[PDB]
Amino acid sequence: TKPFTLPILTIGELTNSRFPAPIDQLYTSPNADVVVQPQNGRCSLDGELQGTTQLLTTAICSYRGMTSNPTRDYWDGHLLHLVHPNGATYDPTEDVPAPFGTQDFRGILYGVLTQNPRASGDEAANSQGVYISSTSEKFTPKLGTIGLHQVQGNIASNQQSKFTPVGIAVNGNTPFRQWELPNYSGALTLNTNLAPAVGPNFPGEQILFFRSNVPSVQGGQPIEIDCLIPQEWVSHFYQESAPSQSDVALVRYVNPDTGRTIFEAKLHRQGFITIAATGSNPVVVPPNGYFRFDSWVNQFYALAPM
Amino acid sequence: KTKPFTLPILTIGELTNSRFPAPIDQLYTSPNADVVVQPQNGRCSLDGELQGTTQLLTTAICSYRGMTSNPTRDYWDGHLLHLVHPNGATYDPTEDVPAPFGTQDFRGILYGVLTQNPRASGDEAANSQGVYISSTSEKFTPKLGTIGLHQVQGNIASNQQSKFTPVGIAVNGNTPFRQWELPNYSGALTLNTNLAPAVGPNFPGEQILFFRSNVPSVQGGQPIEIDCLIPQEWVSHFYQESAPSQSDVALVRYVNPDTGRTIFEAKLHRQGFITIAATGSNPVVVPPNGYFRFDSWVNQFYALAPM
Numbered sequence A: 001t002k003p004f005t006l007p008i009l010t011i012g013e014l015t016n017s018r019f020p021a022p023i024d025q026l027y028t029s030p031n032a033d034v035v036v037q038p039q040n041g042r043c044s045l046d047g048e049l050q051g052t053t054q055l056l057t058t059a060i061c062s063y064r065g066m067t068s069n070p071t072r073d074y075w076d077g078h079l080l081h082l083v084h085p086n087g088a089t090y091d092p093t094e095d096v097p098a099p100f101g102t103q104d105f106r107g108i109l110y111g112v113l114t115q116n117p118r119a120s121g122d123e124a125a126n127s128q129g130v131y132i133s134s135t136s137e138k139f140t141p142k143l144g145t146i147g148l149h150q151v152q153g154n155i156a157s158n159q160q161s162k163f164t165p166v167g168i169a170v171n172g173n174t175p176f177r178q179w180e181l182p183n184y185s186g187a188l189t190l191n192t193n194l195a196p197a198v199g200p201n202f203p204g205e206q207i208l209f210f211r212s213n214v215p216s217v218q219g220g221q222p223i224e225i226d227c228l229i230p231q232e233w234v235s236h237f238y239q240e241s242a243p244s245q246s247d248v249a250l251v252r253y254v255n256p257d258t259g260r261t262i263f264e265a266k267l268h269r270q271g272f273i274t275i276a277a278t279g280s281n282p283v284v285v286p287p288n289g290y291f292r293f294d295s296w297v298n299q300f301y302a303l304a305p306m
Numbered sequence B: 001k002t003k004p005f006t007l008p009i010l011t012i013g014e015l016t017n018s019r020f021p022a023p024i025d026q027l028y029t030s031p032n033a034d035v036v037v038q039p040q041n042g043r044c045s046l047d048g049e050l051q052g053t054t055q056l057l058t059t060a061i062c063s064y065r066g067m068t069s070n071p072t073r074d075y076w077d078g079h080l081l082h083l084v085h086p087n088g089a090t091y092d093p094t095e096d097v098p099a100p101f102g103t104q105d106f107r108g109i110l111y112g113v114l115t116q117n118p119r120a121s122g123d124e125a126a127n128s129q130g131v132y133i134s135s136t137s138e139k140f141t142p143k144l145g146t147i148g149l150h151q152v153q154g155n156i157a158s159n160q161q162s163k164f165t166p167v168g169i170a171v172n173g174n175t176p177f178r179q180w181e182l183p184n185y186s187g188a189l190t191l192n193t194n195l196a197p198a199v200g201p202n203f204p205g206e207q208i209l210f211f212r213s214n215v216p217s218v219q220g221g222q223p224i225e226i227d228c229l230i231p232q233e234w235v236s237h238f239y240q241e242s243a244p245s246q247s248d249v250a251l252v253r254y255v256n257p258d259t260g261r262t263i264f265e266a267k268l269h270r271q272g273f274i275t276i277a278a279t280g281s282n283p284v285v286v287p288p289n290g291y292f293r294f295d296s297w298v299n300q301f302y303a304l305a306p307m
Ligand SMILES: CC(=O)N[C@@H]1[C@@H](O[C@@H]2O[C@H](CO)[C@H](O)[C@H](O)[C@H]2O)[C@H](O[C@@H]2O[C@@H](C)[C@@H](O)[C@@H](O)[C@@H]2O)[C@@H](CO)O[C@@H]1O
Pocket: A075, A076, A108, A133, A135, A136, A137, A171, A172, A173, A174
C-alpha cells in the first residue's frame, strides 16, 4: 500500500493548526485536570479532517459573514451571521460542531473586522479592532451567529465582513482556557459532531504538543496555544491519504546533520503524538531537526523516556 | 528513481495567495502592458527552489518581526522596526536576498496590527496598534534591515520586540496600490538585489494566468486585488517534492476530476508561473471541483489552443 510519510519541515517551518502563528516550541504536560478535545488541527493519519478543521491557515480563527443591525447589548454591539471561511453558505444541520475554523477555546479572540470599502474615510476607516469572546452567550456559531465586541473603531451595520485574527485578550473575568470548548450553540445545549478527546493509553506517557506563543493584547501575560499536529501535517495527510497500517506510527525526531535520533514518539492514527515523559516541560529540539516516520507499531510499544 | 513532477490536488477554494495571506478567489488573466511582473513572494521553481523573499508559512507573508527603537519625531514613520526574519532568525543585509523573507513586494500601504510587550494597562486592545507600513516610504529599506511604522490606531512602544500581523491594504491621496511595482528595498538611490526574475509570455499570443485574491481594503474606495504566480500550497508542494524539471515547460491541464474532462491546457514554466493562449483582462471561470494536473514536459514552443 501507499507508504505513510511526514513532511520534511523543521520546527521553524511549521504553523499552529489552532491559531495562525508559527510553532515555536514542542511542549508536554499531564493536563490532569482537563479533557483535551480541540476541534481545529484535527486529522487522522490517513487524511480525514475532523472537528472544525479545514486546510487553510487563513481560515483558522477566521470568521466571515453579514453584520446585523446594532443590538442593545453593551458587549456584543453587533452580531455576525456566519458563512464558512471559503464563502460557502452555512447550514446548521451540517455534520460539524460549527463553521470550519471556528475558535475552539473559551476566551477572547482579538482581531480586525473589515467591511465595505470607505471612499471617504480617514486612516483605518474600514478596519475595526474587535473582540470575539467564546464565553459570550451570543457566541452561538453552531446556530450561525456570533457576537462582535468592538474595541477600536466602529462596526458598520448590515455589511459583508471579514474577521482576521490577531491575538488573544484576557480581561478581569475571561481567562484564556485553551482546553475548554465553547458552547457552540450556547449554554444548556450540547455540542455536536466533535472530534474525539485525546490522551495517552500506556503508562508513563503524555501528549506532546506543537506550541505557539501568540500575541497577548490585554491582560499582561504571555499566551500559549498547543495543537496536536501542525497545519502542514493536516495538509500533508489530506494530500497523501496513506492507509494507516496500525493504531500507532513510531516516529523519530531526527537531526538530519548527524542522522541521530533526538527522541522517539508515538504518532497515533487519530492524529496526535505521545511520548514517554512526566511533568509539564518544553521538549528541546535542534532547529534543523524534524519528525521522520519509522514504522507501524502498536499501542504497547515502550518508548525510551526523555 | 526519477521523482515525477506533480501538482497538489487542491481546488480553487482550497488554495492560498502566496503574496498576501488570503484565500484564492479567482483565476485571472491580463496582458499587463506597461508593467514588469516581478513579484518576490510566491516565487518557487518547479524543482523546489524558493526564490526572492519567498518562504514556507502563510503566516509570514507580509509579516514583520523585530525591535522598535526610539521615536523618530518624523510625521509619518513615528517608529522604525529593526527586522529579523519572520521565523526569528537574525537578519544580515549581506544575505543573498532582496530583503527579509515575507517582506511585502508591491508599492502601497500595508495595514495590520503591531503587537509588542504585553502591557500592564487594563485597557482593551492595549498591546495592539493599528499600523501602516508604506513600501513607498523613504524609511522602507528592509534590505538594510529597517522599515518605517506609521501608527493609525494606538501608540507604538519604543525599544520593544514586536510582531506585525497583516490585515489589508490602505490607499491614501498619494499612495495608490501598485501590485506590480517593486519597493526599492534599499531606497531609491540603490538597485534591488537577488530578485526572482521578471516573468512573462515568451511569445505574443500568450498571457500569464494568475491566482487572484480580493483582499481587505481598509482605506480607500475600491476593492483590492492581488495576483500571485502560484499559490502558497504549490510553493510548499514543490519544496517538499523537489522533482527535477525535465524541460522548460510543464504542460498542465485544468481538469474536472468528476468527469475526466479537460477545461483548458496551460504552460507551467520551470520558473514557477503559468501562461495560457489568451487576449485581454478577464477572470477565467473554472469548475469548483477542478484543479491543475501535470500532463507532460514540453518545450517553449508548445502552441496552446487560443481562448
Ligand atoms: C468587561 C466585563 O467584565 N464585562 C462583564 C460581563 O462579562 C463579559 O461578558 C461578555 C458577554 O456579554 C463576554 O462573555 C466577556 O468575555 C465577558 O468579559 C458580564 O457578563 C456576564 O458574564 C459573562 C461571562 C457572560 O456569561 C455574560 O452572559 C454575563 O452576562 C457582566 C455581568 O456579570 O458584567 C460585565 O458587563
